[PDB]
Design a protein around this ligand. Structure first.
Ligand SMILES: Nc1ncnc2c1ncn2[C@H]1C[C@H](O)[C@@H](COP(=O)(O)OP(=O)(O)OP(=O)(O)O)O1
Ligand SMILES: [Mg+2]
Length: 418
DNA sequence: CTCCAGGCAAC
RNA sequence: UUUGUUGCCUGGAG
């Protein structure tokens, strides 16, 4: 059966290689991903037989406080490298059980389904005429999943009694705070390999309820949004779905994140819209500011690495960042930020030549006319003031940086579009 | 299509 | 320090 299908050698080996490639910090027994192969070889005959007998209880998850981009504290649950391996072996077998019957409008944590599909369908509804959105998010979503309602939904397709006892055992296994087990009443661990799938199993009935209601929607994780023709119809369905998820699935709504507002005034998965009739996708103001804050720390303030290294470090971030944010339809702001990136990268190049004699030595070697070299080498202006001056743009502008190995932001934006 | 070193994003 | 999933991307062994 399913526990036998989970404990199959090929399914365990692929699950092992995942946590190995993850390189995640150890659980509460302190054993690392590096020791994971050596640890299971010694403890396998026990682990295998003790969970075959239904006597196996997993070790508690490690509490780690990480800050969220919103500001608040996110509590993580880090399982034992074995407890991460076992959950993986459960996930790998539970995906073909649950995934095909998941919603067409479900996009979160799913194989072959991305954030772009969630936005393309989202712009496709407002383009059709549904020019109002009911954006919704859930209060501490992974912390608030009810154990009884969840395994009710797990038992719907899974008939094997041994795995239902095993998943419950993982859910019931507590946390370690000051060397003591702290039993869990509600919540699936924020860091359990299986836990993102269990999140989709619970809210599949919410998907089924919305599909029965005949509503045009997009869901990614707990961040769900329904696309309506009007503000009156949106406000109406804002309360009736809140009542549904609070009663039938027992979940609390984050009212600070949830709104009935216009799609272009709100952000969805790092993207926003334009007030146009056929609405174009734009960068959300949070996503622009997260980029700008990252470039400020990547470019040298009082930092000390090699500049050819720095250019490559800027390269790997920007080219990756544009890989996700290729979906935006406004290249104008993308043209500005690349110019801003060049402008910011000019600042740390200007301070590198600290001496006035080195300033003249390099600018004359670059090709710039002596008339302009001596005019700006001994200037009294500030460091950020000098980076916008006509002469520093001539010696060190667009043509210089591209020759120095800086990969252009806009060039690869159109390359990924083509 | 599977796996390895790394990176970007969403959650 | 910092976990997990999912998508994509650069390079590599098949
Ligand atoms: N880095 C992560 N690692 C593991 N799980 C994560 C991570 N980020 C998000 N999740 C999971 C747990 C969250 O409950 C769920 C939905 O994300 P999100 O709404 O941002 O957080 P949240 O619901 O815990 O907080 P909030 O109460 O502030 O809305 O996705
Ligand atoms: Mg939430």
């Amino acid at each position: 059966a399913l526990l036998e299908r989970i404990l199959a050698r090929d399914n365990l080996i692929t699950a092992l290689k995942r946590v190995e490639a993850n390189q995640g910090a150890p659980g509460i027994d302190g054993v690392s991903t590096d020791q994971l192969r050596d640890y299971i070889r010694a403890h396998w005959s026990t682990i295998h037989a003790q969970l075959l007998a239904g006597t196996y209880r997993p070790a508690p998850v490690r509490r780690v406080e990480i800050p969220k981009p919103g500001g608040g504290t996110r509590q993580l649950g880090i399982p034992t490298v074995v407890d991460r391996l076992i959950q993986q072996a459960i996930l790998q077998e539970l995906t073909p059980i649950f995934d095909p019957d998941f919603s067409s409008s479900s996009f979160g944590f799913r194989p072959g389904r991305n954030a772009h599909d969630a936005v393309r369908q989202a712009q496709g509804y407002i383009q059709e005429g549904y020019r109002y959105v009911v954006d919704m998010d859930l209060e501490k979503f992974f912390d608030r999943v009810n154990h009884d309602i969840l395994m009710s939904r797990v038992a719907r397709k899974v008939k094997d009694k041994r795995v239902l006892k095993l998943i419950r055992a993982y859910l019931q296994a507590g946390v370690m705070i000051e060397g003591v087990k702290v039993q869990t009443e509600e919540g699936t661990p924020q860091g359990g390999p299986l836990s993102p799938l269990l999140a989709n199993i619970l809210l599949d009935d919410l998907d089924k309820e919305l599909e029965k209601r005949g509503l045009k929607f997009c869901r990614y994780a707990d961040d769900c949004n329904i696309y309506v023709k009007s503000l009156r119809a949106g406000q109406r369905v804002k309360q009736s779905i809140q009542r549904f998820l609070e009663k039938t699935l027992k979940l609390k709504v984050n009212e600070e994140k949830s709104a009935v507002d216009r799609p272009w005034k709100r952000a969805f998965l790092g993207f926003s819209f334009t007030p146009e009739r056929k609405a174009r996708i734009r960068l959300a103001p949070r996503s622009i500011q997260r980029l700008k804050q990252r470039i400020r720390q990547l470019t040298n303030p009082n930092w000390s690495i090699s500049m050819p290294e720095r250019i490559h470090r800027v390269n790997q971030y920007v080219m990756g960042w544009i890989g996700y944010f290729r979906l935006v339809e406004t290249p104008s702001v993308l043209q500005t930020i690349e110019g801003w990136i060049r402008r910011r990268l000019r600042l740390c190049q200007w301070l590198q030549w600290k001496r006035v004699r080195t300033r003249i030595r390099e600018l004359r070697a670059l090709g710039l006319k002596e008339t302009a070299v001596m005019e700006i080498a001994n200037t009294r202006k500030g460091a950020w003031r000098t980076t916008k001056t006509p002469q520093l743009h001539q010696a060190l502008g667009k043509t210089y940086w591209t020759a120095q190995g800086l990969k252009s932001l806009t060039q690869r934006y159109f390359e990924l579009r083509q």
